[PDB]
Amino acid sequence: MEEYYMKLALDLAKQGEGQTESNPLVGAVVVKDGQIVGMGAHLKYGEAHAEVHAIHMAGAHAEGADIYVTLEPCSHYGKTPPCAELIINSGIKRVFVAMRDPNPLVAGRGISMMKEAGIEVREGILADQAERLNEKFLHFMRTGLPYVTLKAAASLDGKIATSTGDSKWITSEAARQDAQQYRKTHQSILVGVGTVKADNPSLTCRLPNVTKQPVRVILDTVLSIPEDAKVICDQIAPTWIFTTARADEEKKKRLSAFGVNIFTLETERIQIPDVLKILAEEGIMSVYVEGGSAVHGSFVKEGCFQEIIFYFAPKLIGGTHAPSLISGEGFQSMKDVPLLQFTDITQIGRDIKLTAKPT
Amino acid sequence: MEEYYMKLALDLAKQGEGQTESNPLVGAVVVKDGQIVGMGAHLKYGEAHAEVHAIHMAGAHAEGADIYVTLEPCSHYGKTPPCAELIINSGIKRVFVAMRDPNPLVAGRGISMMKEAGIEVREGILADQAERLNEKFLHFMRTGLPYVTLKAAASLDGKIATSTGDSKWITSEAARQDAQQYRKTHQSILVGVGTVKADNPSLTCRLPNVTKQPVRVILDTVLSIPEDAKVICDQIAPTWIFTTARADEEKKKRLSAFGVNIFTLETERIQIPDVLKILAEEGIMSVYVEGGSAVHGSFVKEGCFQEIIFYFAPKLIGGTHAPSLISGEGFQSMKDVPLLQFTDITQIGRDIKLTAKPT
Amino acid sequence: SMEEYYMKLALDLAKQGEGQTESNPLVGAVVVKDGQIVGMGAHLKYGEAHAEVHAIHMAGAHAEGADIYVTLEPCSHYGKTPPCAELIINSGIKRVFVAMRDPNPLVAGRGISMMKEAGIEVREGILADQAERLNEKFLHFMRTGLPYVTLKAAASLDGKIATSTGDSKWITSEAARQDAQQYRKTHQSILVGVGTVKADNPSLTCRLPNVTKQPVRVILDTVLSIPEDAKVICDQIAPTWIFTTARADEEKKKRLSAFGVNIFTLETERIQIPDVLKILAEEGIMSVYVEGGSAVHGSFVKEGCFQEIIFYFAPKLIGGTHAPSLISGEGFQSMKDVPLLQFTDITQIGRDIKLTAKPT
Amino acid sequence: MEEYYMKLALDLAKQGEGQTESNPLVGAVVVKDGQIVGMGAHLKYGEAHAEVHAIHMAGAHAEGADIYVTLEPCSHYGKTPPCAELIINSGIKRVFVAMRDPNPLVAGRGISMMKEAGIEVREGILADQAERLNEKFLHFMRTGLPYVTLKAAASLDGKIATSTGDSKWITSEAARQDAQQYRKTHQSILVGVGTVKADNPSLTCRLPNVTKQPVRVILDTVLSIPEDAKVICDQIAPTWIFTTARADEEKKKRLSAFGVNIFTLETERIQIPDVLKILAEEGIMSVYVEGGSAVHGSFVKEGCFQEIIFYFAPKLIGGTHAPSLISGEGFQSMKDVPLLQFTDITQIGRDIKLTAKPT
Numbered sequence A, B, D: 001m002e003e004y005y006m007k008l009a010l011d012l013a014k015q016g017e018g019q020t021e022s023n024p025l026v027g028a029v030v031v032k033d034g035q036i037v038g039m040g041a042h043l044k045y046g047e048a049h050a051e052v053h054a055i056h057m058a059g060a061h062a063e064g065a066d067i068y069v070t071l072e073p074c075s076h077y078g079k080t081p082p083c084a085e086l087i088i089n090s091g092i093k094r095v096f097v098a099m100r101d102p103n104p105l106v107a108g109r110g111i112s113m114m115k116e117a118g119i120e121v122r123e124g125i126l127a128d129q130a131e132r133l134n135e136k137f138l139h140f141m142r143t144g145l146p147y148v149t150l151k152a153a154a155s156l157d158g159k160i161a162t163s164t165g166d167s168k169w170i171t172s173e174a175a176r177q178d179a180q181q182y183r184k185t186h187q188s189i190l191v192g193v194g195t196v197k198a199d200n201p202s203l204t205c206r207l208p209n210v211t212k213q214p215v216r217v218i219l220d221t222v223l224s225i226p227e228d229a230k231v232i233c234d235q236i237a238p239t240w241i242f243t244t245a246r247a248d249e250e251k252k253k254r255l256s257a258f259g260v261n262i263f264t265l266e267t268e269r270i271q272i273p274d275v276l277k278i279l280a281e282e283g284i285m286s287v288y289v290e291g292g293s294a295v296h297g298s299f300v301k302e303g304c305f306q307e308i309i310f311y312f313a314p315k316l317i318g319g320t321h322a323p324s325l326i327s328g329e330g331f332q333s334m335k336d337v338p339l340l341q342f343t344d345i346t347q348i349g350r351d352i353k354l355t356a357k358p359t
Numbered sequence C: 001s002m003e004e005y006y007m008k009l010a011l012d013l014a015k016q017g018e019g020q021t022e023s024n025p026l027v028g029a030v031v032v033k034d035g036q037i038v039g040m041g042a043h044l045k046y047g048e049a050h051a052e053v054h055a056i057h058m059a060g061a062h063a064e065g066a067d068i069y070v071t072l073e074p075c076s077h078y079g080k081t082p083p084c085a086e087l088i089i090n091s092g093i094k095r096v097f098v099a100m101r102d103p104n105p106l107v108a109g110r111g112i113s114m115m116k117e118a119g120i121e122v123r124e125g126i127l128a129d130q131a132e133r134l135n136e137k138f139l140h141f142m143r144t145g146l147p148y149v150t151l152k153a154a155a156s157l158d159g160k161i162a163t164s165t166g167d168s169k170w171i172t173s174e175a176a177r178q179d180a181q182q183y184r185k186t187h188q189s190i191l192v193g194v195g196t197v198k199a200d201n202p203s204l205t206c207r208l209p210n211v212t213k214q215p216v217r218v219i220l221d222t223v224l225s226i227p228e229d230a231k232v233i234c235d236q237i238a239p240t241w242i243f244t245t246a247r248a249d250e251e252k253k254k255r256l257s258a259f260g261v262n263i264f265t266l267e268t269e270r271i272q273i274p275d276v277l278k279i280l281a282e283e284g285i286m287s288v289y290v291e292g293g294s295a296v297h298g299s300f301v302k303e304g305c306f307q308e309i310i311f312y313f314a315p316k317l318i319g320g321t322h323a324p325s326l327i328s329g330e331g332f333q334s335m336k337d338v339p340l341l342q343f344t345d346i347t348q349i350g351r352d353i354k355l356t357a358k359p360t
Ligand SMILES: NC(=O)C1=CN([C@@H]2O[C@H](COP(=O)(O)OP(=O)(O)OC[C@H]3O[C@@H](n4cnc5c(N)ncnc54)[C@H](OP(=O)(O)O)[C@@H]3O)[C@@H](O)[C@H]2O)C=CC1
Pocket: A151, A152, A153, A154, A160, A161, A165, A166, A167, A170, A191, A192, A193, A194, A195, A196, A198, A199, A219, A220, A221, A222, A223, A224, A269, A270, A271, A272, A290, A291, A292, A293, A294, A295, A296, A298, A299, A323, A327
């Protein structure tokens, strides 16, 4: 029964998937005398939290009742009493948090606030699942870095283009559509100029209710990206480019007026850990790296990736000097190559979709 | 009920695999009055035919009986009467064929020879299953060339070794063990000398009962193979080298004394179509092409393969100088790269086997 | 199938009211504004807020121009607070997805009618079968004015309840006993004959974890020969309604009533099943779990008054004529007049096999 | 791979099912130098044995070869040489048995006869699969009593008729048709005169594929069976009657003249135990007891059934005077009713088919 009520809280929480933007999905269940009297979930960014809806729905049955919450109740004494306090004043006797605040700084303030009020607080009930709920979000608060997803579509022999650099549709139609989805679940999309220049890619999640365009990030060491690129122009979604001192001053103040946020790095070459640091500062909590063989390589030798997604089409491109899946410096020795782990294998159309994760 | 007996025949047929060599696997069942009176499969090479075994067993019950054969009964007059004529004499009144002879000048010949004696003949029953069974052989007999299977193991990102050639631990032990099956269903294992230089493998079948062993085929352009390589000294299996006129006649000597057979081609380079044709006139019908990013490339560029099987491990070898699955030429435009079709997506241990075929 | 997803969700939310509601049906609602799930609700406590109400509130302004999926046709009647249908009209909602209509044919379609007048597109159907299973009993009691009748028994593989002597110590496994106990939780009453009382002195209560308002213990007497001794009488754990005839003894009747036992006397010398179910139906009993009496089960099958059969067969053979079979009594003489049922479930609880079936 | 061969030998044996009738199911597979060259199965009663077939099919490959049998090689020295010999004469190195001949007397002779000829004898391989293959034969040979299967059809409330004896629509045509199958997997059908005097059956499996009608056995204490009954006049099959000294002499003759075997038991009442003993002494190894709630009673009361089948219908008959499934005495105390065990619960049409076995 304990875990039951918590499972429900989870299921409610999930209903708000893709509706909170940069807020954590959350659910809550108010049980009273062995009867569910209140249920709730964070449904829309900036609107009522999950503990609120539930409490309200439970009304007078809140007092002397329990309340299962997926994540630790809000505890800032901001512009309104916090959900941690709102739980207090409602007369709830026992609270069942699943997992604590992601922010090392706040973690516990909620549990404390309540516990010192006489509320019995139990933690960890199904916290194993109350973890999967918001991977990307929890990663960000725990590591201050965005959640990186590396994606690519390649031939069966790991070539993302032919000798000519021609990528005239390696993967099928169904593949694109699928891959598109990720452009909606990530705060940003990232590519290296080597792609940009040779594709003028839009990089705009063209899915259902977009209600928020992802930041388009380009990596350019000497800032050579042409001004006739849909990312430079078409002011659809934001466009940030990272570069070194090597960029032209005028071109920089130019495109900077066009809305393009140019970030300059004081290093010889652009260092991935540095751009993921910047981004986490500009509030981005996730990046969808899908650009260039070289960019995918720097991301690998660095270890800056949480997820790997490759689309493999029934076709052999071949060619020794044809761009391969991952480039970069690589790993000279096999004993130094880290061990990933296949997460999921699913066939999209005639193509195959392999997905893996670290350790 | 027709497919029950035709399926019994298919399972009997298979009880002789790898005991016929360049001959077809055939199963035969004689049903009398709703009762199985005789079973048979082609067991040894150059020995009794499945129809022979089954009809003898069937004895006098052969008369007024039926018989389900997985392949048009032998209809030529050699040392012994053909099986079709053998059917005709036993008094069988009905024959069920799964498929006609792969040879054009023989197909349907036995069928009519039988009809001709008042025998009612049906066909197609479990045609596909009957196809799959002698798949390689069928190809060989229809195309005149060996059935070619390409096989390689690479990290998830298609690399088959690092920038330094280090390829230790790319395929799990569970894998090698699986891939070892093809060393039992193919009449030859081929690799370039490069593979002999890099890993000096025995290329032998090391599965449980391993009666016979496949012919180890190495493509060594200028006979630079190392005279001390296992493939040249273990005597565990045959070894055939394919070289050009640039080889050393005195080395071919030293090597022939070892039991290896050295084919000397006339072209400057080595054409896969060339060796493939010789392997066939030699009775070799199936070829399992293992190592050789370049070798695989030739077989592919020449379109000389029937099945691709790649093992992918949850690892990422970076590498701007790393060897990918297929090297060499390579198609210049996507509008030319041939479309394959995944036939199976099996997960082996923490690894993953992808197998696909052309067209 | 995005519609069905939202309706499936609604259904799921409704199941959560499985406990508190008593008579009131389980209902789930979900409001969606521009592909987003703005509000969720369900009927959680008898006499309190209806499903639609909760979800519509939690939706706020989003309600305006949204769609709402309800597992049952919305309120249409006017009494204390505004009817859920009127609430939907007023909230903005441009379209409703109703799974099934109201059971009481006196109301059936009244809500749908109303919302339609207000220009709300009403799409009926989505997952009706499911919405039907959610209140299988409630609906029956509503569409037929009679309780839901579940008959349960446990016999030997050859259909016996005891041996030639009456022994029956180990006829059905403990796993079976327990599995059969869950129904005591899903019914509003348990029916049993007098024989079973005077022969087992049963508690006919629910021991399964988490119980609220014990079911009504209903005993079919005749000449009121039930022992004042104990259990259904002294055991003051749950209500006990005894049905008697004229033969009953006056003194004894008001003696049992001196406790809290309710007594119903009929004007016939043979407790007729249909009469009992009707009295129960009137008294507000939407469901009966008749496990008692070999004969008790007989009346219920002859009169044809049962919507579910649950027979537990142990892997034992008792045999012997004169051994008490499953259903004693009148039965059916000619075969032509034997009703055909339908096996709805074949499970295996421990050593025994639990067979269940329902009418044509 | 020693279990492969035995498992294979098992399948081949199953191909003889319901053809060997009185004989058991054996499967002989001869292997040499790592490859099958022999396969056989007992296909027809009074004909070649599983070994005989695999030998001759192995010929000279039998010299210094193995051979797997499912049942201890025959030793009945007579008309031809005991298979024990063919195994030695053919020059067989090793021999494998899955189990020993269940026949008390010859439950060693075969294993030995070759064992002393010097051949290594490994036995017990896949003995459970080889046990299930001849569940009925095994029983008979071990206990000296036939395999007894009881069958009955009834309403869900355990009735076999209405209070007025009506029983027109109990089990659907599916269950009745399923019921038939047994009629051919048994050597005889047991039923009491009541059944004859009641339904005057033909007691023959109508299903077209029978070249050996089962023995019709009637238990009739005082010989009151109708003289013009199908079971006597239609002489489509053998008809055995078990009666007592109360049987009217003249009538015994009248019936026996019709070619009906009358066994007059020496007791006053028919004892299933005696009847069974007598039946085995005549060849019958199996018996399928249908009719007789009275007869079933006996068989149960004596504990003379290795298996029982009950077909239930989705109907409630009811009736304090309606005939129960098992009639007669029955067990007086629950601490005395044997415990069976459910073996299969497969539905047939609207009916359900319950099957359980002893201890
Ligand atoms: N099928 C698929 O999944 C995809 C295929 N492609 C195709 O594959 C190929 C991939 O492009 P590729 O040329 O390898 O290059 P990339 O798109 O990875 O761009 C590489 C360039 O970006 C800059 N860059 C990359 N990594 C870093 C780093 N770590 N730090 C600083 N700067 C960095 C450098 O710019 P500079 O040196 O100029 O300063 C470098 O030359 C193309 O032919 C493209 O068309 C592209 C995307 C997806």
